[PDB]
């Protein structure tokens, strides 16, 4: 059934180990509690159509770039006016757009994704395994 | 008879180990 290379080395995942996950939960709980302790603050949630139909495909943050000259422009540029926290479920897909975003980002992803694209740690601020 | 059934059950319980080998695995059946 398989006719490919068989790896000999397995890499551990310290970022998503039990104690690291517990610390992630502890550190994110305080920030979430402090954010909710303040009024009139909205949280955006981003995911993929294949991991969520009912959810709207267009929101205030979305920019919907349509021109070739605007390809480099981010699509979540204006999310900072409306939202105080972006909960992302597809950091690999949204990495180029969450880079240097002016609102805190809480990313949910798998150890495989983290290891295959470690650059997502430069766009994620809080991690929930 | 209930006692005859008990004797048959005792014989089936104090029986050999199915497979004659002393291996370290029980195999299910893939027939049917």
């Amino acid at each position: 059934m398989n006719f490919n290379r068989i790896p000999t080395r397995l890499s551990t995942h310290y970022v998503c180990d039990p104690y690291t996950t517990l610390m992630h939960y502890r550190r994110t709980f305080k920030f979430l509690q402090a954010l909710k302790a303040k009024p009139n603050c909205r949280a955006l949630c981003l995911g993929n159509k294949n991991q969520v139909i009912s959810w709207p495909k267009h929101f205030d943050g979305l920019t919907v770039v349509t021109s070739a000259v605007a390809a480099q422009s981010s699509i979540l540029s204006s999310a900072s006016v409306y939202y105080s926290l972006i909960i992302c479920l597809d950091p690999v897909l949204f990495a180029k757009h969450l880079y240097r975003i002016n609102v805190p980002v809480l990313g949910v992803c798998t150890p495989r994704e983290i290891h295959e694209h470690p650059e997502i740690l430069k766009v994620i601020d809080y991690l929930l395994p | 008879x209930x006692x005859x059934x008990x004797x048959x059950x005792x014989x089936x319980x104090x029986x050999x180990x199915x497979x004659x080998x002393x291996x370290x695995x029980x195999x299910x059946x893939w027939x049917x």
């Binding site: - | 008879x1 006692x3 005859x4 004797x7 005792x10 014989x11 319980x13 104090x14 029986x15 050999x16």
Partner: protein, 71 residues
């Protein structure tokens, strides 16, 4: 002859004696019922089985007495 010995090896002497007596009693009841229904059975299956079991029990009693004398 080996299969019966292997199957009954786990059974202790007392348990085997109880089972033999139970089989003798069941054969007696079955033969009485057959006589009541017909009187003269058309087959001697249970008759021969009961005869063999009784002979075996008598021989086993004699063997136990022989063991007693040996001790």
């Amino acid at each position: 002859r080996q299969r019966a010995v292997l199957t009954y090896a786990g059974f202790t002497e007392a348990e085997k004696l109880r089972l033999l007596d139970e089989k003798i009693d069941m054969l007696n009841k079955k033969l009485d019922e057959d006589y009541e229904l017909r009187g003269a059975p058309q087959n001697l299956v249970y008759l021969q089985l009961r005869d063999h079991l009784q002979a075996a029990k008598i021989s086993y009693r004699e063997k136990l007495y022989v063991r007693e004398t040996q001790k």
